[PDB]
Amino acid sequence: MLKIILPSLMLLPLTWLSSPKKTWTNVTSYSFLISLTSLTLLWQTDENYKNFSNMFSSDPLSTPLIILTAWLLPLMLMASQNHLKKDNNVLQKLYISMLISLQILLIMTFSATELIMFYILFEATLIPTLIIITRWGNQTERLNAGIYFLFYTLIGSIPLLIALILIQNHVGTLNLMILSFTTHTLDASWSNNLLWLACMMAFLIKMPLYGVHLWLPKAHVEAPIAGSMILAAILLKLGSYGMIRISIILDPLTKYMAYPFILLSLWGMIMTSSICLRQTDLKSLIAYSSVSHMALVIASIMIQTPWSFMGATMLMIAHGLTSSLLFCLANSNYERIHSRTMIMARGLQMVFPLMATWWLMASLANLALPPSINLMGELFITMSLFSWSNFTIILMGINIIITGMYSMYMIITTQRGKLTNHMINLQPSHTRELTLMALHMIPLILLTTSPKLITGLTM
Amino acid sequence: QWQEDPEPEDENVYAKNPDFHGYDSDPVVDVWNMRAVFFFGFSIVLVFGTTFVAYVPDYRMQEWARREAERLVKYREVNGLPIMESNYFDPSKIQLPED
Amino acid sequence: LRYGLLAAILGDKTTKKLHEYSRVITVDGNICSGKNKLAKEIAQQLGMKHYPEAGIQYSSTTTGDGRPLDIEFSGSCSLEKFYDDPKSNDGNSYRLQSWLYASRLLQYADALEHLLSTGQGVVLERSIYSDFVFLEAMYNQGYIRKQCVDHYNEIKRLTLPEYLPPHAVIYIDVPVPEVQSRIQKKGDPHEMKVTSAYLQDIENAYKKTFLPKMSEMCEVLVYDSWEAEDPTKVVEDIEYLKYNKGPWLKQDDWTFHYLRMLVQDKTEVLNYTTIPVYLPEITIGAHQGSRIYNSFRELPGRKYAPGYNAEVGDKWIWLK
Amino acid sequence: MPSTFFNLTMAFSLSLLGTLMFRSHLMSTLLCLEGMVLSLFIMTSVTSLNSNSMSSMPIPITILVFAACEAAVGLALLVKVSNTYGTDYVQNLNLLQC
Amino acid sequence: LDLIWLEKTIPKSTSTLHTNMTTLTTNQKGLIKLYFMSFLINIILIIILYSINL
Amino acid sequence: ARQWQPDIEWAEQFSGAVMYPSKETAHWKPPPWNDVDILKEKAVTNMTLNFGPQHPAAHGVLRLVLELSG
Amino acid sequence: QLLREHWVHILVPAGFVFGCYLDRKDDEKLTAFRNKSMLFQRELRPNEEVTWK
Amino acid sequence: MNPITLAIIYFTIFLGPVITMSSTNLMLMWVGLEFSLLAIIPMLINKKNPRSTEAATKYFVTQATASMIILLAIVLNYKQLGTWMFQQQTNGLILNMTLMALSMKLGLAPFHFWLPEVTQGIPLHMGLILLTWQKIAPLSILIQIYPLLNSTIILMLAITSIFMGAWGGLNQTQMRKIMAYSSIAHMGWMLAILPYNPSLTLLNLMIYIILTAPMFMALMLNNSMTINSISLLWNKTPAMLTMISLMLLSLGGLPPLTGFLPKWIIITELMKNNCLIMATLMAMMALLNLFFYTRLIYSTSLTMFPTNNNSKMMTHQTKTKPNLMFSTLAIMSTMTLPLAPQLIT
Amino acid sequence: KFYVREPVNAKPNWLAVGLSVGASVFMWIYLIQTHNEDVLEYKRRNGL
Ligand SMILES: CCCCCCCCCCCCCCCCCC(=O)OC[C@H](COP(=O)([O-])OCC[N+](C)(C)C)OC(=O)CCCCCCCCCCCCCCCCC
Ligand SMILES: CCCCCCCCCCCCCCCCCC(=O)OC[C@H](COP(=O)(O)OCCN)OC(=O)CCCCCCCCCCCCCCCCC
Ligand SMILES: CCCCCCCCCCCCCCCCCC(=O)OC[C@H](COP(=O)(O)OCCN)OC(=O)CCCCCCCCCCCCCCCCC
Ligand SMILES: Nc1nc2c(ncn2[C@H]2C[C@H](O)[C@@H](COP(=O)(O)OP(=O)(O)OP(=O)(O)O)O2)c(=O)[nH]1
Ligand SMILES: [Mg+2]
């Protein structure tokens, strides 16, 4: 893991020592090489786990998240290097440093073998995205969004720290494999119920669970494009990864303690899909779609079925890719028309045909068109939920119907229809942003071609 | 009023550089950034990395598990054994509690 | 900063280096009234350092290369624009007044540092004690407003009592029609567009507030033009002046030491001129402030500390 | 000795109560401080004389020395307060709330 | 739900509670007479707590 | 298009020394920048003494009204 | 002058080589069960001294 | 102040806590406290303004009353046991009076009402000297008698200290008051970990000192006493915004800053001693502390408040004010979390 | 002469430069010597 961590660390001196006319080129190229290096974690020819060191290890669950982070860093640089052209050189290098630090800390968080180090890197990732949102956001409400994000996460994560220290005192090491082997069954008392809630509520906050999801739409709206990408594509999945890692020592009382959160997830995905149906802001629509998909992931992890875990992993990877792609397309329209209003730009299919093709493919990925990994994850989550209870199919079907409805509504109101001819400032297309859309869509196609990479721990 | 700078207007970047690629204002850095993004992103990652992942062998013991399953099926079918025993563990080595 | 408590202990005593001509003499008058020549001749024939009137570009001329910088770096205020349109809605008048007060504060700190360091006397033209006359003239002509006056008075209260007043204040009394005639003879088209009401407000502010307030703590030397326009009788009076009042008598070595440290720390001098009172005539905003600050930092010789700018010929940077 | 020591402890308690319950006079507060000091001296002195601890007999004198330095500094501060306001009123000493 | 009642329930109610508490605790008059009377109350309460704990 | 930055009202919401005004603290003022408050000049209460006329040093018939500071 | 003006291109490869070296250091640090696992307990071939390096 | 009286006053300020820490005798520890108080009063009142006079008066009467209660405890112990040290069998009333008086000297709630007011109205360097140096000697006295103290009263004092510090820091805009309520909260943490492990008390004290020193130095760069005054720091000293943000986040206890380490290890020791309720409440109020730190960061670094016209002249002038020891303390208070096993014992 | 006033850092403080370089060299040399002596003492105490 050190062979990925060290050159990502060396990206920062490269950023601060490169010429201002060469910084973007050098950092983008070497981050692409970093991702190519990170692809060596897929060499898993055995049932064992690649425990590289005493503090770093690789997993069938951790590996796709690490590869996705390393792949998202150059895409974030390409996405963010347009709204920083009228910007100071040291501020540009600081922004690149923030993105690189996010990538480093997220790779270390996913490769961590010890839960206290996982929590330390959790908060370490909490810092620079707050800095990015607050400093390079556009509207006034970025400060309130950053406060909401930071303190939802902190109030979640403090009882997680208390619970981790308690489990460390009880067991001795807080090492993941040691806990997985010497797991003890809890006796289902009120203290154990509170311990369960303490170690689950941080991840449920960052997922986000319904009712506590209020930080996410304003944070994603007010964030810059790279911040929205890293948030919606890695940090929610970081919460899910924490849930999967910590759920192994919570038997058996997760069986009955999972009940309120499954109901919250299902009804919240219905409610947030309805909000997407009636939402006037494109980034808000994408954010609430992310809330619904992560609610599906929450329900799968709560029901703790091998099909549910596999569908959760596939939906994590697929939703990260398609949500970053949707945010990049919305940011292209935002850099064109300087607005986020859903209905303001309408006939963009006429002027931007290839970008309309990218929009259509992103939305078809969003509504889980087969045989994509989006549909793979959603279908296996549905199968596991129907095994858990046959009446969940009603909520699943309503969610699927509204999902297709808001995705096609987005397509029709942003691309189809008559062209808003007053928008004289419609530059044709940037090869940079078309490349960004291609670099989002192609890994979706390749993972659709070979879905065995992102199945996860259970299969 | 407070001496605040007026709102900057985004000019048409294609007006002065019709071959603009989205990366930088001057054409040379722009075209070299485009070449670096395409070459290091598409050519050597989306092709060589895809080939490497495609030629990772026996990924999580898929084909090994298939071959071992075929061998065990042949053995248990020519020896009259059950295909799967109902108990994974032998009951002789398990000490049940008395009551 | 080389001077400090260690240098004071090793011996840098101001009272040791004082003499009979270690005086602060401020020459004051109306807009065009014999003030530049009188101060020059007084300093020349008393062996004192002459400080001309602190203009807009005083800090620019005393820092860096010493060339006059661009106007947006130096205050973003124009005396010619004030003369053309004194009641302009952008707020040029009070911006000019506050910038000139800050420039006079910097010049007074420079003169005090020079006097406490070398012992040579200083002859200033129109120091900080005679700038509220322009403020009150602007206010009584309606050019600025009461909030501007309150902000100026707050800054003056924050900055003025930290220093010592001049030993001698020389005043030139020239009547308003004579000032108008001299302005016409000078021939500046912008300066010709001044009002006798404004000039009379300056003179009234002088006679009603400046002269008695300096009379209670230093020696006042009101002269007419004919007693002036001949800088030898004034010099003879200065020679036979007896300084027997004011706060200069109670000063000792350590009070001089702390005053010298204050006037040699220039950011400490200008600390209260940048109070965060958000008056719209003087507050700027983040975008314009960043643009001006970045342009000033990319100015030659201003990117780093003095002595560290390699583009202007600084050497041995890696050894310091 | 125990009744005397209890009375001295109650005297210290009364002087501390006077110090903690202000009236208008900072000088009266300083006098309450000096009464606390006096009670401490008498307690230490009778303890040393009862236990025959001649080695610890310099301790009450040290208490008096440092307490008199405290009273001296309090008088100097009261001088500064009276120069500021004209009186020693703790109700005048109140403008640091904001 | 989202623009009204979830906001009224968790974040705005938490901020309102802490704003009320910080006003109530930083509503001091700046009088050392009141501060020392409070200190006397603290002394009495500590003595009572020790006497009941034993 | 341009990033929002705090204007005069956002910059002025942080001055007032309390940050959360109420009825019992709305009368507060921010502390001075130099921590030197402008106080009302107290009148000097000099003692007035009738030196004489019944005084050995007043020579019998002098009413020396003496205004004394100490 | 290419070494002077393109010296920044070696920082990331140097970090990669250093990371590979540190991974080798961790591999040789964790050798307490080298050819001692009950799954892979095999007799050493005469031309080798370790099972893995 | 002439150098003779500067040397005398500063040497006595230094000598007070040194005598207190080196003294075996309770009476010599007490006279070290007297030395510290008496020597620090003239430098508090050195500026000779009404606010400085009020601050010096309040500090004098508070520390004098607390020292008299300390002397009462010492004399009562000498009466009971015949010695000049709380050995093992001194009365719990005597120990509680010692704890209460030392907590009033330290300035933790509910004895905290003077500390923001004394910190206001004095210059920034004297606020630094107060909030760092003046707490070492009372903490040393508390550390010497750690197994004898009452955990219930200590935990109550600690939890109310952290609560009142969080709420006061939330309300205040004056930088000196903000730093004083920060001191109250961190003193609450130190007192909370005092009866269980005084090594962690010393660790938290050292972390707080090396975090408080450069924050006060950065305030001392421009005499920024207000949120707005520190908000226009981007025009004055733009190179200090990152270190200001990092030090404020370290004061907030955010990982991976080294200021997370004292709160983390104190929580760990409390969990080892089974005080989970106290640990969780202290952690939530520490989150509130981090909130007012984050609002300060928003004001000074992440946003850009409007500047003045004379700030152009201030940029024309040059400064040599930030000393050599600023950056060392800032780095050691920012990026030292991986050396946590070395920082703990 | 570019600046109107002579900067305090116009010429390098040679005493400070020499003292700092000598301190760095002395500390490195002393560090290496004490590390070698510590290695030798550890070997001599543990019989290696
Ligand atoms: C984001 C959501 C935030 C709020 C919900 C957080 C989780 C709620 C449920 C857990 C209780 C609170 C966290 C406790 C962390 C430690 C848990 C643990 O170790 O449990 C076992 C322990 C029990 O210890 P034990 O396991 O050693 O028990 C010993 C048992 N015997 C003797 C049989 C062996 O539980 C506790 O100690 C819990 C005490 C909690 C007291 C303080 C609660 C304060 C309020 C909490 C919420 C504050 C934030 C929100 C405020 C409002 C916002 C709108
Ligand atoms: C792992 C975590 C990842 C996280 C995100 C990473 C992003 C960065 C990615 C960088 C590059 C890494 C690529 C990873 C995927 C590699 C795909 C691949 O080559 O898979 C191997 C596969 C053959 O493998 P095989 O074992 O035969 O498959 C299982 C059968 N037992 O090979 C093949 O089958 C050949 C594939 C290439 C040939 C072209 C295929 C074109 C397919 C067109 C599909 C059209 C329809 C699409 C519909 C979409 C609807 C939305
Ligand atoms: C279905 C699940 C149900 C169960 C889980 C419920 C909990 C979910 C997680 C909690 C989320 C809380 C979110 C808190 C942040 C939102 C509040 C906020 O942003 O307030 C802002 C406001 C200051 O606004 P300001 O910027 O000054 O003004 C606007 C323009 N100037 O701020 C203020 O006015 C004051 C802000 C105070 C600090 C708030 C954050 C810290 C809260 C500490 C909680 C302590 C808990 C223990 C309390 C003691 C014991 C009861
Ligand atoms: N409004 C305003 N104008 C000022 C201020 N200080 C100087 N001026 C203007 C007045 C004149 O037009 C110009 C030059 O000032 P002087 O008094 O030195 O005039 P000048 O040199 O022409 O004549 P003189 O020195 O009297 O022989 O600067 C000020 O504070 N406010
Ligand atoms: Mg002139």
The DSSP result for C222-282, as a single string, is EE-TTTSSSTTHHHHHHHT----SSTTTT--HHHHHHHHHHHH-HHHHTSGGG-----TTT
**What's the gap in Å between C32 CA and the centre of ligand 4?**
7
With left for phi above 0 and alpha for psi between -120 and 50, is residue C154 left, alpha or beta? Answer: alpha
- Structure token pair of residue A423: 């928008």
* End-to-end CA separation in angstroms for chain A: 23
**CA of A158, nearest ligand number:** 1
A contacts of B34 (beta carbons < 8 Å)? 431-432, 435
Nearest protein CA to atom 54 of ligand 1, as residue: E10
Strands C49-51 and C122-125: parallel
The answer to whether H319 contacts chain D (CB < 8 Å) is no
Question: In whole angstroms, what is the distance from residue A368 CA to residue A448 CA?
Answer: 12
How far CA A97 is from CA of A15, A101, C149, in Å, comes to: 7, 6, 47
F contacts of C286 (beta carbons < 8 Å)? 5-6
Probe site for chain F from E17, E18, E20, E23 (most F CB atoms < 10 A): E23
Q: ∠C180-C183-C187 over CA atoms, to 5°?
A: 140
Residues spanned by the domain of H88: 2-344
Cβ distance of F34 and C285 shorter than 8 Å: no
**What's the gap in Å between H170 CA and the centre of ligand 4?**
50
- Count of domains observed in chain H: 1
Instruction: Provide the CA A448 distance to its chain's centre, in angstroms.
Output: 19
Instruction: Provide the CA A253 distance to its chain's centre, in angstroms.
Output: 28
Query: Which chains are within 8 Å of H by 3+ CB pairs?
Result: A, C, D, E, F
Question: In whole angstroms, what is the distance from residue C256 CA to residue C261 CA?
Answer: 9
Beta carbon of A372 within 6 Å of any ligand 2 atom: yes
- Structure token pair of residue G8: 């920044």
- Structure token pair of residue D80: 């500064």
List b or e across C273-302, with b for residues whose CB sees 16 or more CB atoms inside 10 angstroms.
bbbbbbbbbbbbbbbbbbebbeebeeeebb
Q: How many CA atoms lie within 13 A of C216 on its CB side?
A: 4
Residues having CB closer than 6 A to ligand 1 are: A 155-156, 159, 162-163, 166, 191, 194-195, 197-198, 201, 205; E 10, 14; H 276-277, 280-281, 284
**CA of A196, nearest ligand number:** 1
State chain A's maximal CA–CA distance in angstroms.
68
A contacts of F4 (beta carbons < 8 Å)? 138-140, 142
Q: Which residue has the tokens 């104190």?
A: H266
Are A276 and A289 in contact by the 8 Å Cβ rule? The answer is yes
For residue H227, give every residue at least 6 positions away whose Cβ sits within 8 Å of its Cβ, in sequence order, or none: F14, F15, H173, H175, H296, H299, H300
List b or e across C27-42, with b for residues whose CB sees 16 or more CB atoms inside 10 angstroms.
bbbbbbbbbeebbbbb
- The atom of ligand 4 lying closest to the CA of C37 is 27
Are H111 and H103 in contact by the 8 Å Cβ rule? The answer is yes
> Residue type for A82, please?
N
How far CA A416 is from CA of A345, A359, A425, D8, in Å, comes to: 10, 11, 19, 95
**What's the gap in Å between C126 CA and the centre of ligand 5?**
9
List b or e across B64-77, with b for residues whose CB sees 16 or more CB atoms inside 10 angstroms.
eeeeeeeeeeeeee
**CA of B47, nearest ligand number:** 2
Question: In whole angstroms, what is the distance from residue H269 CA to residue H266 CA?
Answer: 5
Q: How many CA atoms lie within 13 A of H166 on its CB side?
A: 23
Closest CA to H179 of H48, H296, H298: H296
Probe site for chain H from A129, A158, A168 (most H CB atoms < 10 A): A158
Question: In whole angstroms, what is the distance from residue A196 CA to residue A302 CA?
Answer: 12
Return the CATH architecture of domain D2-98: Orthogonal Bundle (1.10)
Q: Is the peptide bond between H341 and the residue preceding it cis, with omega within 30 degrees of 0?
A: no
Solved using: cryo-EM
- The atom of ligand 1 lying closest to the CA of A170 is 27
**What's the gap in Å between C133 CA and the centre of ligand 5?**
16
Beta carbon of C82 within 6 Å of any ligand 4 atom: yes
- Tell me the angle at which helices A23-38 and A2-17 cross, rounded to the nearest 10 degrees: 180
Instruction: Provide the CA C133 distance to its chain's centre, in angstroms.
Output: 13
For residue E44, give every residue at least 6 positions away whose Cβ sits within 8 Å of its Cβ, in sequence order, or none: none
Q: State which H helix or E strand residue C28 sits in.
A: strand C24-28
Beta carbon of A67 within 6 Å of any ligand 2 atom: yes
Q: ∠F20-C271-H128 over CA atoms, to 5°?
A: 65
Beta carbon of B78 within 6 Å of any ligand 2 atom: no
- Structure token pair of residue A223: 């964030």
- Structure token pair of residue H130: 């107060």
A contacts of G18 (beta carbons < 8 Å)? 6
**What's the gap in Å between A388 CA and the centre of ligand 1?**
29
List b or e across A257-269, with b for residues whose CB sees 16 or more CB atoms inside 10 angstroms.
bbeebbebbbbbb
Domain residue limits, chain G:
1-51
List b or e across H44-55, with b for residues whose CB sees 16 or more CB atoms inside 10 angstroms.
bbebebbbbbbb
Strands F64-68 and C24-28: unpaired
Closest CA to D1 of D35, D38, D50: D50
- Structure token pair of residue A289: 């779609």
For residue C139, give every residue at least 6 positions away whose Cβ sits within 8 Å of its Cβ, in sequence order, or none: C145, C146, C148, C149
How far CA C232 is from CA of C23, C32, C38, C50, C221, in Å, comes to: 17, 20, 9, 16, 13
Best residue among H155, H267, H276 to mutate for probing ligand 1's pocket (most ligand atoms within 8 Å of CB) is: H276
Are A314 and A451 in contact by the 8 Å Cβ rule? The answer is yes
Are H156 and E11 in contact by the 8 Å Cβ rule? The answer is no
Beta carbon of A36 within 6 Å of any ligand 2 atom: no
Q: Which residue has the tokens 């408590």?
A: C5
Q: How many CA atoms lie within 13 A of A72 on its CB side?
A: 33
Provide the 3-class DSSP secondary structure of residue C36. Answer: helix
Q: ∠D33-D35-D41 over CA atoms, to 5°?
A: 110
> Residue type for H299, please?
S
Closest CA to H149 of H157, H273, H107, H110: H157
Q: Burial of A95 by CB count in 10 Å (0-12 exposed, 13-18 middle, 19+ buried)? A: buried
Provide the 3-class DSSP secondary structure of residue D96. Answer: coil
A contacts of E13 (beta carbons < 8 Å)? none
Best residue among C79, C83, C95 to mutate for probing ligand 4's pocket (most ligand atoms within 8 Å of CB) is: C79
- Structure token pair of residue G38: 């009950």
List b or e across F59-68, with b for residues whose CB sees 16 or more CB atoms inside 10 angstroms.
eeeeeeeeee
D–E interface: beta-carbon pairs under 8 A: 30
Angstrom resolution of this structure: 2.9
